[PDB]
Design a protein around this ligand. Sequence first.
Ligand code: BEF
Lengths: 49, 195, 195, 200, 50, 101, 150, 50
Amino acid sequence: KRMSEAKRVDTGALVEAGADLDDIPVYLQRLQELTEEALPEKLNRFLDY
Amino acid sequence: SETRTLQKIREATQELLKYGLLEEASKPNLYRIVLSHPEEVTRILEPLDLDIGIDEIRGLLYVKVRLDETPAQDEWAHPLVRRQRLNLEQSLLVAILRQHFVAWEQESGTGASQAQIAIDDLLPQLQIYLGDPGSESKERTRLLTLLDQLKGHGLVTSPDAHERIVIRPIIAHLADPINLQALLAWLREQIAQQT
Amino acid sequence: SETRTLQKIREATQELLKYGLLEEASKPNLYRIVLSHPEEVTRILEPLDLDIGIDEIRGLLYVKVRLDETPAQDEWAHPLVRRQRLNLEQSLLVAILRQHFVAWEQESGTGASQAQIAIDDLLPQLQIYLGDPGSESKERTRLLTLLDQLKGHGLVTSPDAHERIVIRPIIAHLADPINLQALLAWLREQIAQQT
Amino acid sequence: TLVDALMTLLCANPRYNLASTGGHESDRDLISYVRGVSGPGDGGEGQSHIARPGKTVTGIAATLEREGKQVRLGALLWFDSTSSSVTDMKRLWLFSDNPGQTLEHWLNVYHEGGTRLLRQMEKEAIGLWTYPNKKQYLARLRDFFEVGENAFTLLNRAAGLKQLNSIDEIFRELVLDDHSAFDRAAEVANSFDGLTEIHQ
Amino acid sequence: IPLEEAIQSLSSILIEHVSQEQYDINQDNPFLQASRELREWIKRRLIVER
Amino acid sequence: SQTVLQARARSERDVRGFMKTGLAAEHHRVGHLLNEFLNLALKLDWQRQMIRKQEVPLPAVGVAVTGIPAIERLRFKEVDDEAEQTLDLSNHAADLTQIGD
Amino acid sequence: LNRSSDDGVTQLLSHIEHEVLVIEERLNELNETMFRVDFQPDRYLRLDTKKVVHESLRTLEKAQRQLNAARFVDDNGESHYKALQVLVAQLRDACERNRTLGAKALLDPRFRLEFAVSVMDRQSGNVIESRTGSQGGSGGEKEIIASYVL
Amino acid sequence: KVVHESLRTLEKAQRQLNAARFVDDNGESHYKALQVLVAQLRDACERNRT
Ligand code: BEF
């Protein structure tokens, strides 16, 4: 259920991933990516602008 | 009393509804407008039971039917869907195109826009399934008719001067794991019925 | 979760966009609801530059372009509303139907229930401008296909079991009814001059 | 009718028959003048009230003279069918300063040939201009008479308009040239789109 | 044989056999009948056009 | 000989181009399901028009809404006239003043 | 319910029709008074009138006709009462919203017919112009319409 | 000279943005003040006939 909602909110980065227990690593890696690299870089750019 | 949606938003959403989908490759000035105000576009499309579908990784936008507070039904039963339901022989070509698309995307990266394929490369592919009529003209006509019918759905452009087509990125969202699993489940039941 | 437009209003709006009109004669539940919530439908359509014009006398609602109030553009252009020019035979048939409708309204009053007209009555009149194509089997078939084509635009009902049609209210709101009169009279004068 | 013949040439969106209404509405259109509609018709199948129902042509010209110099405005409007709709009328707005150019000559040329003949004539003859749409012709009129685009609208609405009901409205809409900074405001608001995209 | 050239020759040859009613040979149009005959050959796999 | 050799070269190039595809997509997730599906497709009888005109349960994406039937959008036929021309531009000298008292 | 009857609405509709007929009859005298004068050199003005059947009245008639039928289907009279309720709802709704032209075109005789001036030919008796207002016209030609009809 | 309420409101928004630059958050206040200002101009352009 919750992976299917993460799919709904997602914006293209999880098109190659289903909602079964097999795909959990993809979701976890995406969350780690957002927490580590993408989010702080985007926030730095936004705060600079 | 009178309150109007911003003219830019009206123009962008009307174009989006007209073509069913919108890309940054062809219409950046509208794609950026739509992606910058997704809440307004979603609330504009909500009355028609339509919703936006965003993909920044590929610069794509497409409208899709809704089911909230009107569950089940059928996505193609919606009154405003103007085109017929997808046809099995078309789905076979869709699968082949998606396979080429995943190959090209995994070898190039998602940023590049030229997910092309040559027409001559598909004819052998279809020969295995649809059979061989012994006439290059007949099979080429068959393939071009299928590609046109897919263009009606927006998954492919028409052949260019070099007999090459561009697989529109919308295909990646049409055939993704959630839908491929359902298609496989349906096809296995069809085969079991054939037994 | 979030607020959703009332199911009945969504159904009415989708129907109104699909067919281009509602009528109390054949869809009372939606037609009355739309009249009881005009501010909701007009708010739903305004983002798309569409707006309902209502004809209470004849019990009709129809969509129309909501573009600006006589802007620098002397003629409107809309992305979704694709304009058409009916071929000659369709124009003649529409003119005949329009004058029949106006003549009937002159007697029974505006919005009076239209009298059913038989197919046999129209062929002699189309003959006045198209001659005899070669057989009854041909002329009747042509008239039937023309009526079916017009039903798509909503001007006439389907021929009932006894081969009579009824003229829909929407005919009164054509874009330029003066054109029908002019062309019809001009062709009539042509045939009268050549005979 | 004679006055509106000139007002059509001078103005961009003229108010036909303004004087009779008192000044607050126009109740005719160029189509009805071209067709010579004589009224609302008998209300039925009749067509006796319309004077030129079939293919027709129409022309108007005005000659202005200072110190012997002649500048002759003009306009040609014609239909190719019974259609009496704005999209089916075909126009040709003429400006000229050659004494030899006259309405009769233009009509003769048209009777000899359509738009192509007049376009060729434009090249053949000196001191003549043509424009297939009214905006360019009115721009030529402006740059000739050295006035803002509001001057001729003022003239047309001064043909009638005996009331002068609100001086503020008159001076805001009919006299002072448009200098609103809406374009500048749109440009300024667009300056922050880069910020909005990043924030989104 | 180029296909268009083949149609011409086949129609000319077929014109000679119109008298053989034993196989129900008609006379409406030799060119269209030649095209139909070539299609029938192609699908029956006697000839392949490439 | 030349024709046969060219045909062989074309076919070999076409198959070599196909083999590279699939190799680069065997263990991609959607590629795996696509291979599964393509394997199943062989069993079907593609000769039967009814079979290859079934309707699959794929979703509706890119749903275009257009051609709203606004009644205003209709225009009527412009039948042209070519019989003659109205050349008359006489001076209308009948305009001599004769007006009521 | 057996003792009940539908006479209530039909009498009201007959009364409204009688009022409309009275209005038309009164205008018929004004037309004859007009005939004696010349609106133009050989034209005499006349006041014409069409009838307006608003969707409200058509719906009321449909409900009444369905009420007539529902009396002969027996479910303890439930269907008949439901039809009567649907019919009474229209009257009540029109009563509360008497200020909207929709109810006016049902209960108000003045709104049951539309008016329009017509110029008649003195010799042939045919119509030359149908004029629902005074749009167009020259002025003086507009003022004469105004003064005559006033 | 007449100053309409709209210009007064825009001036007030200008001052509010000027003051809000200094609040210590990650733009959730400065950006809001900037956009509530730009919205006035967007509305003015949209309804330029009012
Ligand atoms: F007689 Be018009 F009103 F100038």
